[PDB]
């Protein structure tokens, strides 16, 4: 004799119906016929008994507010068996609301139906008076509605834009209503931003794919798993990105900026990526727009390489060398920065726009001061990014020509006035970067006599040089020789003592501005000899040391004297006129600092 | 010894920011108060409370209802309530007179979320009526 | 039968009370009457026994230098029970020297009083003997003295004082001694400050309360139990700040502040927590004054929130907008700082007394530079803290109004005098913040001229522009367009060559007031053409550059020149006097400086 069944249940399905399954006897090893009835307690009282050779039961168009008591008894299907004893009998309570479905669970612009049957005091309302709203604010509109039957009421919802949050909840609530009068119950929608926007890259070694997505939306609704599903077509992305059939998962770790993070290795550089994110829940899945990607196209530029710069031989241009970039193969234009070394780089750009010119050549106002250089590379149709900074390049500080100009030096006499052949020790001055390039070896004294002709005596690197000095006429040039020849503008001074008298200066004149500026004036006389310059010397009145000169453009009347003067000390202030035969009569006064 | 103005004005301050503090949360305040919902007629809601005897039995009520709610909010906006009980109970002391002291479930269980929000809004519908019939000489 | 009594115990009180107890029998479920025997083993040796329902006994006058041995039996109290076995006996032996009491803890003001029986080789000396000595420093008058017995020394302090911390020794140490014969044993009396100020913040979100107390005081004695004990009251706090009997233990830790601190939560939020802290110390237990709060009352008033500081176009005014705090819900005094941005800042102050303004306008010395404003905020009846500083918030550079003045501008010549096309360089300087107000977006040089009417050029940010002057006459009008507009108060500038003959100046004369200051004299003639005013031009003599202007008005007739003067080189001060139809014939002298 068969055992009564078992495991009797019972639901309301979406579609406003009633499904009845039940466990049936596995230690049974014959088929069974199952008894099931049922007692609609609704507004109707109906009760009946049906026949099933299967578990499973359907009753349609249930009514609201009804009750339903099911029994099921079992019996052997085949010989002459005997109807087992009845299951237990279970209870359901409908309510006043019946839905079409009760809930839908979607992605953003899909097509979204709800169907109503609304009790109100045993009478099931026209669908012409069945009316909906979306969490109590607003009637729906009336072209949104339709009637599947004049109980079963029909609501539609096109173009679905994503439900902006109210609150913690994620869905929209839907009550169905005799107009003014309704249920308890509620609905709900569930739409999200589903069109998400995952940011895929390559690395600079083409060896990775790196996917980033932020779901700030997705952690609202819990209970259900996430995942990144995709697809693997062979070559390129076709136009329509879809999911094919076949679909494959892929693991994930999330970082601590909220983005879940995807590290792909090895990578098909050709074969396009369908991808997207799906979203298994308990009332169903959503998948995220399926996007393709192709990896070549993702590829972060990578910087120029081998970069030396140098300054050009004998032009004093910025030359930069470098290596392209292994990828891409494509052509690029080259933004170089450039300027000074130290803290602050005065950053100015060059456009390169060849791709071939692995080198290039710029402008610069010092020929050996360091210099901080970075290239960077797009490709040419700007479908991609800029690539990383080259290396910063440096300069060497190395001459690069001859000296431009050799320094200025003056005379001072030793000796008696009367005997003739007198100690003049030339003192110079070091030559900054501005004429001595960035270096000086040594400096020359080339002479240049009437007995005695032309002769150079080399000095090295010191700043004087006391010579006898005997003949009459006695032209004397100094040479600044760095590492690779010789200074180019030098300064001839002559030496006669006829010309010794000759006077170029009406006046002098001296006031003190201050302690540290002396300032000078002087009218000149209408000199016959070609005069290039004068030579200031002052001095503390009376002394034999405290001697100091500088040399002055003839051509102006004013001179600024910034030097450590004592106030107490009154300085004499001689101007010596220099030409071309010889030094001229000096001009001297005398005046307080 | 009890100074009685320092009372009201304590008992409004706290309604006011009992009523506030659950004004905060976004979803309730586009809900309509008034709509009626079939159903949930044991829920206290809008039916003159026009004595303290009234006024107590609903808060008692309504402090029934949240003590099964598993939110922190509304447990401390309940402790609220019950030092507002006790205070009703100070007050009818003031004035001299005596004060005595299931289904839900069946609702929290089909239909948490419009159980809640309807409770609540009803909730911040008692405060503003008895704040509204505080002054015209509330009587037990 | 019922078993032997066990459990016995034995113990002297502080006044010589004897008390003996032993362990009731709960094993039997009927009530035993004790028979005890004690035997005194003292200078006389005595024994005796009682019966006693309870299990306690009490034998007064405990003798010094005393055994005493104890035996217990019990016996049914209802029915013919039977005697159980008598218990072990328990020996025990006294001590001599005598204090009432030992030690005392109280406050400034009490009346102490304290006594010793003193033993002086194995004598009790009279009370006329005993001596009482503070600390063994100085005697305590007799007058304190008094005589309970001629064996028990008396004294008394009325009226106390706080017993000041002697390092370590925070109490007083009384010997009583055979007047200089003095023992060891010495009273202990203890006045200790337990007044704390403790700071109690409920949580931004009225769940959870945070109190805050500094032990500043307590940290002085060690060894003793200090702890905070917590009361809460069903409704508000007691008028008067009371001990409720019943109270509990409030675990709480300090922290690196020096404050402790702990939290109750959840909160019950009108339901009044009296706390205070009681230190069991060895003498009891001192017991800070209970002070009661309502959590309420010191929530915490959070920074404002969402605040913006800019500039009020129009008005010039410091607008400053923000939100009130989610709590507290009472009304708010409001304090605000203001001031300059930069690494150094001074802070302009101002208070808001009405919590209805969420908006203020403000006054600033600076109208357009870079502002740093932080907010805080309070309950207006300050029963509460002071919110920290907002985050700072920033200005943005926007003009306030199109400019007042425009910019004083003055001609270059340039080109030969027969030439008529001459390059007419037009040189201005920027307006100040109170002509340009903010800023001055761009320069707008509007000519006018009898052939093309007016039409202007726009000149950008240069305060020089260089244009060719053809016609005879030609007018020029420079405006310092803001973001708004254009200066509303402007000067015009004609230049024209036949009425530039057109003298104006009848005398003038230079004088050398310093090395940084000139002063400028000059007589005018009387003007026919309409002299808005001059244009002293002054350079270096028989130079080109060093050419500096001043626009001087004409109703003036002394002036004052400011420069880094160069007293060697003569100086040419050419005052240009300007007229309504153009530039008049400059008056030239030459003067030192």
């Given at each position: 004799?068969?055992?009564?069944?078992?495991?009797?249940?019972?639901?309301?399905?979406?579609?406003?119906?009633?499904?009845?399954?039940?466990?049936?006897?596995?230690?049974?090893?014959?088929?069974?016929?199952?008894?099931?009835?049922?007692?609609?307690?609704?507004?109707?009282?109906?009760?009946?008994?049906?026949?099933?050779?299967?578990?499973?039961?359907?009753?349609?168009?249930?009514?609201?507010?009804?009750?339903?008591?099911?029994?099921?008894?079992?019996?052997?299907?085949?010989?002459?068996?005997?109807?087992?004893?009845?299951?237990?009998?279970?209870?359901?309570?409908?309510?006043?609301?019946?839905?079409?479905?009760?809930?839908?669970?979607?992605?953003?612009?899909?097509?979204?139906?709800?169907?109503?049957?609304?009790?109100?005091?045993?009478?099931?309302?026209?669908?012409?008076?069945?009316?909906?709203?979306?969490?109590?604010?607003?009637?729906?509109?009336?072209?949104?509605?339709?009637?599947?039957?004049?109980?079963?009421?029909?609501?539609?919802?096109?173009?679905?834009?994503?439900?902006?949050?109210?609150?913690?909840?994620?869905?929209?609530?839907?009550?169905?209503?005799?107009?003014?009068?309704?249920?308890?119950?509620?609905?709900?929608?569930?739409?999200?931003?589903?069109?998400?926007?995952?940011?895929?890259?390559?690395?600079?070694?083409?060896?990775?794919?790196?996917?980033?997505?932020?779901?700030?939306?997705?952690?609202?609704?819990?209970?259900?798993?996430?995942?990144?599903?995709?697809?693997?077509?062979?070559?390129?992305?076709?136009?329509?990105?879809?999911?094919?059939?076949?679909?494959?998962?892929?693991?994930?770790?999330?970082?601590?900026?909220?983005?879940?993070?995807?590290?792909?290795?090895?990578?098909?550089?050709?074969?396009?990526?369908?991808?997207?994110?799906?979203?298994?829940?308990?009332?169903?899945?959503?998948?995220?727009?399926?996007?393709?990607?192709?990896?070549?196209?993702?590829?972060?530029?990578?910087?120029?390489?081998?970069?030396?710069?140098?300054?050009?031989?004998?032009?004093?241009?910025?030359?930069?060398?470098?290596?392209?970039?292994?990828?891409?193969?494509?052509?690029?234009?080259?933004?170089?920065?450039?300027?000074?070394?130290?803290?602050?780089?005065?950053?100015?750009?060059?456009?390169?726009?060849?791709?071939?010119?692995?080198?290039?050549?710029?402008?610069?106002?010092?020929?050996?001061?360091?210099?901080?250089?970075?290239?960077?590379?797009?490709?040419?149709?700007?479908?991609?990014?800029?690539?990383?900074?080259?290396?910063?390049?440096?300069?060497?500080?190395?001459?690069?020509?001859?000296?431009?100009?050799?320094?200025?030096?003056?005379?001072?006499?030793?000796?008696?006035?009367?005997?003739?052949?007198?100690?003049?020790?030339?003192?110079?001055?070091?030559?900054?970067?501005?004429?001595?390039?960035?270096?000086?070896?040594?400096?020359?004294?080339?002479?240049?006599?009437?007995?005695?002709?032309?002769?150079?005596?080399?000095?090295?690197?010191?700043?004087?040089?006391?010579?006898?000095?005997?003949?009459?006429?006695?032209?004397?040039?100094?040479?600044?020789?760095?590492?690779?020849?010789?200074?180019?503008?030098?300064?001839?001074?002559?030496?006669?003592?006829?010309?010794?008298?000759?006077?170029?200066?009406?006046?002098?004149?001296?006031?003190?501005?201050?302690?540290?500026?002396?300032?000078?004036?002087?009218?000149?006389?209408?000199?016959?000899?070609?005069?290039?310059?004068?030579?200031?010397?002052?001095?503390?009145?009376?002394?034999?040391?405290?001697?100091?000169?500088?040399?002055?453009?003839?051509?102006?009347?004013?001179?600024?004297?910034?030097?450590?003067?004592?106030?107490?000390?009154?300085?004499?202030?001689?101007?010596?006129?220099?030409?071309?035969?010889?030094?001229?009569?000096?001009?001297?006064?005398?005046?307080?600092? | 010894?009890?100074?009685?103005?320092?009372?009201?004005?304590?008992?409004?301050?706290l309604?006011?920011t009992i009523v506030?503090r659950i004004?905060?949360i976004?979803?309730?305040?586009?809900?309509?108060?008034?709509?009626?919902?079939?159903?949930?007629?044991?829920?206290?809601?809008?039916?003159?409370?026009?004595?303290?005897?009234?006024?107590?039995?609903?808060?008692?009520?309504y402090q029934?209802?949240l003590?099964?709610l598993?939110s922190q909010n509304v447990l401390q906006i309940a402790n609220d309530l019950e030092?507002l009980?006790?205070?009703?109970?100070?007050?009818?002391?003031?004035?001299?007179?005596?004060?005595?002291?299931?289904?839900?479930?069946?609702?929290?269980?089909?239909?948490?979320?419009?159980?809640?929000?309807?409770?609540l809004?009803?909730l911040?519908?008692?405060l503003?009526?008895?704040?509204?019939?505080?002054?015209?000489?509330?009587?037990?």
């Amino acid at each position: 004799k068969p055992d009564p069944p078992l495991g009797l249940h019972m639901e309301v399905t979406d579609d406003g119906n009633l499904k009845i399954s039940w466990d049936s006897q596995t230690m049974a090893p014959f088929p069974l016929q199952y008894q099931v009835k049922y007692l609609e307690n609704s507004t109707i009282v109906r009760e009946a008994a049906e026949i099933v050779s299967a578990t499973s039961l359907l009753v349609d168009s249930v009514l609201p507010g009804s009750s339903y008591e099911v029994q099921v008894r079992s019996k052997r299907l085949d010989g002459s068996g005997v109807w087992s004893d009845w299951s237990s009998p279970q209870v359901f309570t409908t309510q006043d609301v019946v839905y079409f479905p009760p809930k839908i669970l979607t992605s953003v612009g899909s097509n979204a139906s709800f169907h109503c049957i609304y009790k109100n005091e045993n009478q099931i309302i026209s669908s012409k008076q069945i009316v909906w709203w979306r969490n109590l604010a607003e009637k729906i509109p009336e072209i949104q509605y339709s009637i599947v039957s004049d109980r079963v009421s029909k609501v539609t919802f096109s173009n679905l834009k994503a439900t902006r949050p109210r609150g913690k909840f994620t869905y929209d609530a839907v009550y169905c209503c005799n107009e003014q009068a309704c249920h308890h119950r509620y609905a709900e929608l569930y739409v999200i931003d589903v069109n998400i926007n995952i940011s895929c890259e390559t690395d600079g070694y083409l060896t990775k794919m790196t996917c980033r997505w932020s779901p700030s939306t997705i952690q609202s609704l819990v209970g259900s798993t996430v995942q990144l599903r995709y697809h693997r077509r062979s070559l390129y992305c076709p136009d329509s990105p879809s999911i094919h059939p076949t679909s494959e998962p892929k693991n994930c770790v999330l970082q601590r900026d909220g983005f879940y993070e995807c590290v792909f290795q090895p990578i098909f550089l050709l074969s396009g990526y369908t991808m997207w994110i799906r979203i298994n829940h308990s009332l169903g899945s959503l998948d995220s727009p399926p996007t393709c990607v192709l990896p070549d196209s993702v590829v972060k530029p990578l910087p120029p390489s081998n970069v030396k710069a140098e300054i050009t031989v004998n032009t004093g241009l910025l030359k930069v060398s470098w290596e392209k970039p292994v990828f891409p193969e494509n052509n690029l234009q080259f933004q170089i920065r450039y300027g000074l070394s130290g803290k602050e780089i005065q950053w100015k750009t060059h456009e390169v726009f060849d791709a071939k010119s692995k080198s290039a050549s710029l402008l610069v106002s010092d020929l050996c001061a360091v210099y901080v250089v970075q290239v960077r590379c797009r490709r040419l149709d700007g479908l991609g990014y800029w690539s990383n900074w080259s290396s910063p390049a440096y300069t060497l500080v190395m001459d690069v020509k001859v000296p431009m100009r050799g320094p200025e030096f003056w005379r001072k006499m030793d000796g008696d006035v009367t005997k003739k052949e007198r100690n003049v020790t030339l003192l110079w001055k070091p030559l900054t970067k501005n004429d001595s390039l960035c270096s000086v070896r040594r400096y020359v004294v080339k002479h240049r006599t009437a007995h005695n002709g032309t002769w150079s005596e080399d000095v090295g690197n010191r700043t004087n040089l006391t010579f006898l000095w005997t003949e009459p006429a006695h032209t004397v040039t100094v040479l600044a020789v760095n590492s690779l020849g010789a200074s180019l503008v030098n300064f001839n001074l002559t030496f006669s003592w006829p010309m010794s008298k000759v006077s170029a200066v009406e006046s002098l004149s001296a006031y003190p501005l201050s302690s540290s500026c002396v300032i000078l004036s002087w009218t000149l006389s209408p000199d016959d000899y070609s005069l290039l310059y004068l030579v200031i010397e002052w001095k503390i009145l009376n002394e034999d040391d405290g001697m100091k000169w500088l040399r002055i453009p003839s051509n102006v009347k004013k001179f600024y004297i910034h030097d450590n003067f004592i106030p107490i000390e009154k300085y004499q202030f001689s101007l010596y006129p220099v030409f071309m035969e010889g030094v001229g009569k000096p001009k001297i006064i005398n005046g307080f600092t | 010894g009890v100074p009685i103005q320092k009372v009201q004005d304590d008992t409004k301050t706290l309604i006011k920011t009992i009523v506030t503090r659950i004004n905060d949360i976004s979803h309730t305040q586009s809900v309509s108060a008034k709509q009626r919902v079939t159903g949930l007629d044991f829920i206290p809601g809008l039916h003159p409370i026009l004595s303290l005897s009234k006024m107590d039995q609903t808060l008692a009520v309504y402090q029934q209802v949240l003590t099964s709610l598993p939110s922190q909010n509304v447990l401390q906006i309940a402790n609220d309530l019950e030092n507002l009980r006790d205070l009703l109970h100070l007050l009818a002391f003031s004035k001299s007179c005596s004060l005595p002291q299931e289904s839900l479930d069946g609702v929290l269980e089909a239909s948490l979320y419009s159980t809640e929000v309807v409770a609540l809004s009803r909730l911040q519908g008692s405060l503003q009526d008895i704040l509204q019939q505080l002054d015209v000489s509330p009587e037990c």
